[PDB]
Every structure is written in C-alpha cells, then in structure tokens.
Design a binder for this molecule. Structure first.
Ligand SMILES: *[C@@H]1O[C@H](CO)[C@@H](O[C@@H]2O[C@H](CO)[C@@H](O[C@@H]3O[C@H](CO[C@H]4O[C@H](CO[C@H]5O[C@H](CO)[C@@H](O)[C@H](O)[C@@H]5O[C@H]5O[C@H](CO)[C@@H](O)[C@H](O)[C@@H]5O)[C@@H](O)[C@H](O[C@H]5O[C@H](CO)[C@@H](O)[C@H](O)[C@@H]5O)[C@@H]4O)[C@@H](O)[C@H](O)[C@@H]3O)[C@H](O)[C@H]2NC(C)=O)[C@H](O)[C@H]1NC(C)=O
Ligand SMILES: *[C@@H]1O[C@H](CO)[C@@H](O[C@@H]2O[C@H](CO)[C@@H](O)[C@H](O)[C@H]2NC(C)=O)[C@H](O)[C@H]1NC(C)=O
Ligand SMILES: C/C1=C/CC(C)(C)/C=C/C[C@]2(C)Oc3cc(O)c(=O)cc(C)c3C[C@H]2C[C@@H]1O
Ligand SMILES: C=C1C(=O)C=C(O)C(=O)C=C1C
Ligand SMILES: [Ca+2]
Length: 340
C-alpha cells in the first residue's frame, strides 16, 4: 500500500517519437501504436523480462502518416486508426478527410509472427479517430471515438474551432461504419484545459461505454444496446472526477472494476464510487520521471496480470504545449496489493 507504486522502464524510442496507445496480445506481448516519426505498430516480446526485445511489426505509410488508437477485436486481431498529418511537429494538425481504419491479423498458423495487414475502411467524414474498443458480445465490431479540430490546417493553425465529439461503430467483417452517438457536451471540449480533445480513450465493460474527457476532468459512462447506440434517454453519467488531462485508461487487474487512467504526467486509480488516487508520477515522489503518459494496459500472462504497462510520448515535462520534447517510452507499474 506504499505509494507511489514500483515502476521500471522497458524501452525508450528516439527523440521525436511518440507512442500513443497499447494492446496486449493473448500470449502477453505488447503491441504499441506510434504517431511520430511514422505511423507504426511495434511489439515488445515477453515484456516481463528486464530487457525485452522490441521490434517493428508494420509501418502503415501506405495509408497513413500517423497511427492513433489500437484495440483487439477477435482473438489476436487488432484495429488501428490513423490519417495523414501536415507535419511530424507535436502541434501538427491532421489533414482533413484522410482518416482510415486498418487491421493487423495475428490469428492462425501463417500469421502468428508476421501478421497480415489490410485497409478496412476510409472515414473521410470523420474528424479525428482516437480510441478503439470492441463490442465484447460481438467482437468483430468496434466503437471508435472521434474528436478534434473542425478545420485542421497547415501551421500556423489559427481557427481552433473544435468539432463536436462523436462515436462510430465499425464492422470489421464488412467494412460498414456509421456514427452511433453524437452531440453531447460530455464528448466536447471548450479548451478549459488549453488546446486538446474532448472524448479521448474509450473502453467497453458489460453494456457500458466508458470514456475519459481530456477537457472537463470527467470519466463518463453510457448505457448502450447491442449495436452500440445509447439506451434512451441516453444521458452520460460521471463515474469520477479529477482536474487533470485524461488520455486513456483500462479496467483491472483481471476482473476488478477499478479504473487505471493516465493523466497529466501522472497515473491515477479510480474506484467505482468515484474515489481517485494518484499512484505514480507528478504529485508523488516519482516527480517528473514519467512525462506524457498516453495509455495503459495490464499484463495477460499467468505471471504478470498485476503489471500495468504504460505508454508515453515525452522525454521531459513540458513547459507549455508549444515546447514539447517528444520521446516515446514504455514503463511497467507493479499494482500488486493496491486497494482503496
Ligand atoms: C449532430 O448534430 C449535427 C448538427 O446538427 C448533425 O450534423 C448535421 O447533419 C445534417 C443532416 O445530415 C447535415 O445537413 C446536410 O448538410 C449538407 C452540407 O454539408 C456540408 O456543408 C455544411 C455547411 O457548410 C458551411 O457551414 C460550415 C459551418 O459554419 C462551414 O464550416 C463551411 O465552410 C460552410 O460555410 C460556408 O457556407 C455557409 C452557408 O451554409 C456560410 O455561412 C459560410 O460563411 C461559408 O460560406 C458543413 O457543416 C458540412 O460539414 C460537416 O459534415 C461533413 C460531412 O459531409 C464533414 O466532413 C465535416 O467535417 C463537417 O462535420 C458539409 O461540408 C447538405 O448538402 C444537406 O442537404 C444537408 O443540409 C449537416 O451538414 C450537419 N451539420 C454539421 C455541422 O455537421 C449530426 O447529424 C448530428 N449527429 C447525429 C448522430 O445525429
Ligand atoms: C534528445 O533531447 C534532449 C533534450 O530533451 C537532449 O538533451 C540536451 O542536449 C543538449 C546538448 O547535448 C544539452 O545542452 C541539454 O542540456 C540537454 N537537455 C536535457 C538532457 O534535458 C538530447 O541530447 C537529445 N538526444 C539526441 C541524441 O540528440
Ligand atoms: C495529443 C494531443 C494533441 C493536440 C495538440 C496538438 C493541441 C497537443 C496538445 C498537447 C497535450 C495537451 O499534452 C498533454 C501533455 C502531457 O504532458 C500529459 O502528460 C498528458 C496529456 C494527456 C496531454 C495530451 C495532449 C492533448 C491531445 O490529446
Ligand atoms: C489530437 C491528437 C491526439 O490526441 C493524439 C495523437 O496521437 C496525435 O498524433 C495528435 C493529435 C492531433
Ligand atoms: Ca489518446
């Protein structure tokens, strides 16, 4: 019960890189998506080792300059989303109407070390695809969060009008996709936290869509039906509050309904009743050791279920968003024995 929790560094990428999200394979290897300097998935094999192997899986340049979110669908298949971007600068806007969803298929004899990769669907009317979460009762379908600038442009960006946030469904078998939830301020930003997004990372648990909002401090959930639409009256519910810039989160370990969420240079745990504790990073004796965490996920091997693996994209604590020093990293946090 001593805080902060124990942590160690698995791997650093080079200056300028950005590790944006993470999915754990059934065999326990990590798959991480990068936004810069290119849009790729990397694998950390056997991440419980002191010095695990880190290998490029696939660079998605054929379709996109950057990847954002990743999520597992059916076992050992993954959906990533991405688009073209005006530049590799940390402040670069996306290029409107270039978003896409792609698949990495590790399932089956032929693919379990070299995956088969394909383009699933173009999303030219989306704004910025962000987080990906499979419907647990129908795992070939995912929800995808979507929010950022309505009018992204080449630098200097001057019109920062935000698009209203929304949630898509995507059928990875047929490629069919549509918006299933939109036009609710819980999905939106008004830049209370500076330039940012509204709805960011998503996860689905039982018949609830959960998400964090990077601008209003809230973790939300929404009751959904089996096609992903909201169950009337369709009103999001606050599950927790903390005045921090949320990015992504997970439930765990194992079957526990505790939320582990990345915040502003810090990691947080939130009880289902709304109690929020800072367990790593800024606000503990960790200080600035983990700048810019972006996502987290628990280990899946029989011998690391309590290890929370954390992706990040900064090499120093930023003074302001216009002076970011990008550097991708992955750390591992030992949550063994944590309780509220
Ligand atoms: C949540 O709520 C929203 C809001 O109600 C719902 O979205 C609307 O859905 C309806 C029904 O499907 C859409 O109506 C159709 O619109 C068609 C034309 O759409 C195209 O033009 C739109 C207007 O463009 C002008 O205004 C915008 C906003 O100010 C400017 O940015 C733009 O530059 C244009 O400005 C010029 O013209 C106006 C005059 O209109 C002048 O005042 C200006 O000075 C300029 O001269 C535009 O908003 C649309 O963009 C949106 O959608 C596209 C997808 O096509 C997407 O790629 C964009 O990123 C953006 O999201 C689009 O370019 C028309 O042909 C058709 O007959 C019908 O009228 C309506 O467009 C939607 N409105 C918005 C704001 O999105 C939404 O459905 C709902 N969600 C759910 C799940 O219910
Ligand atoms: C990666 O970026 C860091 C800064 O985030 C670089 O570190 C700086 O290096 C200069 C010149 O060597 C020093 O004057 C600064 O004091 C350093 N700042 C630090 C350490 O915070 C680092 O050199 C970069 N790496 C490479 C290979 O270029
Ligand atoms: C990626 C992005 C891009 C949009 C743009 C171009 C305006 C950048 C803003 C930088 C910003 C505000 O920086 C943070 C910094 C950290 O230090 C940290 O620990 C945690 C978070 C969660 C964030 C998230 C991002 C916000 C947005 O999601
Ligand atoms: C807003 C985003 C975001 O949230 C995350 C990303 O990975 C990224 O590459 C940058 C954009 C602009
Ligand atoms: Ca994110």
């Amino acid at each position: 019960v001593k805080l902060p929790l124990p942590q160690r560094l698995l791997h650093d990428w080079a200056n300028g890189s950005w590790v944006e999200n993470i999915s754990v394979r059934p065999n326990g290897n990590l798959l991480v998506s990068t936004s810069t300097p290119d849009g790729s998935v990397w694998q950390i094999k056997e991440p419980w080792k002191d010095q695990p192997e880190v290998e490029l899986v696939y660079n998605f340049d054929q379709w996109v300059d950057r990847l954002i979110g990743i999520g597992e669908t059916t076992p050992d298949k993954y959906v990533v989303v991405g688009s073209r971007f005006y530049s590799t600068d940390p402040m670069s806007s996306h290029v409107d109407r270039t978003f896409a969803a792609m698949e990495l298929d590790f399932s089956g004899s032929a693919n379990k070390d070299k995956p088969a990769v394909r383009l699933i669907a173009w999303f030219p009317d989306a704004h910025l695809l962000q987080g990906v979460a499979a419907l647990p009762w129908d795992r070939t379908k995912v929800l995808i969060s979507d929010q950022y600038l309505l009018r992204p442009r080449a630098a200097p960006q001057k019109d920062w009008t935000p698009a209203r946030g929304q949630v898509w469904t995507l059928d990875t078998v047929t490629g069919a996709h549509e918006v299933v939830f939109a036009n609710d301020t819980a999905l939106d930003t008004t830049y209370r936290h500076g330039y940012d997004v509204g709805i960011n990372g998503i996860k689905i648990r039982r018949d609830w869509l959960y998400w964090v909002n990077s601008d209003d401090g809230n973790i939300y959930r929404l009751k959904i039906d089996k096609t992903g639409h909201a169950v009337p009256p369709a009103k999001p519910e606050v599950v927790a509050f903390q005045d921090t810039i949320w990015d992504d989160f997970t439930f765990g370990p194992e079957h526990e309904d505790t939320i582990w969420a990345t915040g502003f240079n810090a990691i947080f745990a939130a009880s289902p009743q709304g109690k929020v504790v800072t367990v790593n990073g800024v606000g503990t004796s960790d200080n600035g050791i983990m700048p810019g965490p972006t996502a987290c996920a628990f280990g899946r091997s029989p011998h690391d279920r309590n290890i929370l693996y954390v992706t990040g994209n900064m090499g120093e604590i930023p003074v302001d968003i216009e002076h970011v020093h990008l550097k991708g990293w992955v750390r591992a946090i030992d949550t063994t024995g944590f309780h509220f």
